[PDB]
Every structure is written in structure tokens, then in C-alpha cells.
Design a protein around this ligand. Structure first.
Ligand SMILES: CC(CO)CCOP(=O)(O)OP(=O)(O)O
Ligand SMILES: CC(CO)CCOP(=O)(O)OP(=O)(O)O
Ligand SMILES: [Mg+2]
Ligand SMILES: [Mg+2]
Ligand SMILES: [Mn+2]
Ligand SMILES: [Mn+2]
Lengths: 180, 176
């Protein structure tokens, strides 16, 4: 697997082996983040596996990943949901296309990404991959938004940044409607 | 180090080496929980190191541990406070003496404990043992309770149980 490197403007310049890429001095590269809701309108919260190189053991939003060469941001979402969670989804909606973030993890691994955010509905049961996800929970968004406000340090920094974006947050809110 | 095996009543009946004691089938044993506050009244919340056998990388209250045979609960707390956080404290005070719980962690490791709960104030600076703590946060009890109330799954199950016990939350709300 690789990542797509980008420059100052978000323009691709090439690719880089995923592992090799994410270090204490990660260069800019393409990524996605997705927030997934069940028919009931509940938000799927997940917990990164202890084996993840960056932010292991950390609670976060439904699924994050890296688009590969040839792939569309949305295909990546569909792929990753399947690989990490075994789940089928409705077409991802773009809810924060300009999100970009740089951050260091507890052991000093750096993420540095152009990371558009999406939301979608799950259309199948979960088949959790425990090489990627160690725990999960179906919640009401409002509870999750209340948790992030009370103790933001208990969750991934990107989960918090995206959730407090007013425009992304309202899109999240629209997905809490029950859909049959 | 060891844990103290307890029968139906909390009577010690023997010991086990500590690592060997926590499994998918952990037997009932003795433990403590402890909530540490600083002079300003902030609660210290910690994150267990990824190497802990049970609940690695999980957010929980300040210090937790296993008294040895013939060791006072109060001494165990003081001992583990020195050991995991290099911190000196005021005499630990009881906040939930009859708490007991069994639970299972995401990898299937179980804690099964008689675990009386205490509180104290630190009298010196932290000096972290990264064998035990991987992260930590000084914060206001009320926000922590808000988070516990909103997203309990983001915290250790015994922390959640303790802070949702009416009497315990009362006494925790007094150290500030
Ligand atoms: C960590 C972010 C922040 O969006 C994106 C990367 O998600 P990862 O899950 O870490 O990526 P990958 O699934 O490729 O391991
Ligand atoms: C006692 C609980 C629940 O409070 C968990 C056990 O405490 P640990 O911290 O895991 O024990 P120790 O520090 O001795 O490894
Ligand atoms: Mg991922
Ligand atoms: Mg401990
Ligand atoms: Mn990345
Ligand atoms: Mn134990």
C-alpha cells in the first residue's frame, strides 16, 4: 500500500510506501475520513487496534484511510469500510472537503494530510477486522458530541477537529434521522 | 509481585504472580482504585501504557493496583503512586469501600476484583513511569464526569462504575 504525496497547493507529485511514509517527519499526502451511521441514525464509533502504527488504542470516528493510485476518494471510503469493518454503505457524502491536518501521536508518529471528510449509511451488518479495529460502539451523535466537548483529549485529535467544524457537524446531524 | 486470591467472602486464601493472574479467566482477587487531585483541585486522569496486560491504552482514574499480603490498602496506593507516577500524596481517604467488579477487555482479558476506592491529594510533581502511563491529563472533575456520563465507553469500565455510584461521586465532588 502507498500514499499519494502532495505539495503546498494540494497537488499530487507521486506516491510513497504507506509504512515508510508515516514517520516522525511524514510528508504531505492524500487521505480520507468517514463518519458512518446505521439505519437508526446511530453513529458508529471505533477504537484503533493496538497494532496501528499511529494512534494505537485510540477512540475515533468510523473509518479513516489512504486513497491509492487510480482510486477515487469515495472508492477508498468504500474499500476501507469493507476491509476494516466488513460493511456495505450508501454513497459517501462530502461534508468537509477542505479538511487538512498535521499532528503528532503519543509516540511521535506524524500524520500530515489532505483529508476530505465523508458521511454515509451502513447497509449491511458489521464484520469487524480486528487487525484494524479493537472495539466499537453505536451511539447517538449528541452524546458523542457531548463527550468530545467535555474531555476532547480522550479521542483522536482529528475526530475532534472534524466534529467541531460547524458545517461538517450539521451534515453529521442530518444523518441521525431514521431511514428505513 | 502478586495478587491476593479471595473466596466468596473477601477472605484471602492464597496468591498468584501478578502477570499470570490476569487472563480470560481471572479469578476474584484484591485491588484498589485511587483518584488523585492536586492542590488546585484538578483531577488527574491517566492513560494506561500499551504494554499493560489489562486495558492497555485506556483512559481511567489516576492510579490502580494490587495490595500485597499484609499490606494496607493505604500503603498500596502510596506505593503505586510512587511507582507509576513518582508522586507523593496525602493520606488516602475512603470514597467507595465496597466496590467490586468483573469485566472483560477488548482483547478478552478479565479483571475480577474486590476493589475499594480511595482519594488523595498529591504533594509533589509527577515523574511518569512510561512502563505504566503513556499519557495523562490534569482536568476538572466536572468535565470528566460529563465525559463519563456522555461517552462511558471512552473510559475504563471500573472508572465509569465508580464515578456513577452516587455516594462515590459525592465524595469525589469535595476534593475540589
Ligand atoms: C489517521 C488518519 C486521520 O484521517 C487517516 C489515516 O487513517 P489510517 O487508518 O490510519 O490509515 P490506514 O487505514 O491506511 O491505516
Ligand atoms: C484495580 C483495577 C481496576 O481499578 C485494575 C488493576 O490495576 P492495575 O493498574 O492494572 O494493577 P497494576 O498497576 O498493579 O498492574
Ligand atoms: Mg483506517
Ligand atoms: Mg496500576
Ligand atoms: Mn497518512
Ligand atoms: Mn487485578
Amino acid at each position: 500500500e502507498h500514499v499519494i504525496l502532495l505539495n503546498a497547493q494540494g497537488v499530487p507529485t507521486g506516491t510513497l510506501e504507506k509504512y515508510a511514509a508515516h514517520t516522525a517527519d511524514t510528508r504531505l499526502h492524500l487521505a480520507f475520513s468517514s463518519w458512518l451511521f446505521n439505519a437508526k441514525g446511530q453513529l458508529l464509533v471505533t477504537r484503533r487496534a493496538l497494532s496501528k502504527k499511529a494512534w494505537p488504542g485510540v477512540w475515533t470516528n468510523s473509518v479513516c484511510g489512504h486513497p491509492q493510485l487510480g482510486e477515487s476518494n469515495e472508492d477508498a471510503v468504500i474499500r476501507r469500510c469493507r476491509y476494516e469493518l466488513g460493511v456495505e454503505i450508501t454513497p459517501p457524502e462530502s461534508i468537509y472537503p477542505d479538511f487538512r491536518y498535521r499532528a503528532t501521536d503519543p509516540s511521535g508518529i506524524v500524520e500530515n494530510e489532505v483529508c476530505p471528510v465523508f458521511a454515509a449509511r451502513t447497509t449491511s451488518a458489521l464484520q469487524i477486522n480486528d487487525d484494524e479495529v479493537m472495539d466499537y460502539q453505536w451511539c447517538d451523535l449528541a452524546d458523542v458530541l457531548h463527550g468530545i466537548d467535555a474531555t476532547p483529549w480522550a479521542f483522536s485529535p482529528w475526530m475532534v477537529m472534524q466534529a467541531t467544524n460547524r458545517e461538517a457537524r450539521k451534515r453529521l446531524s442530518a444523518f441521525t434521522q431514521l431511514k428505513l
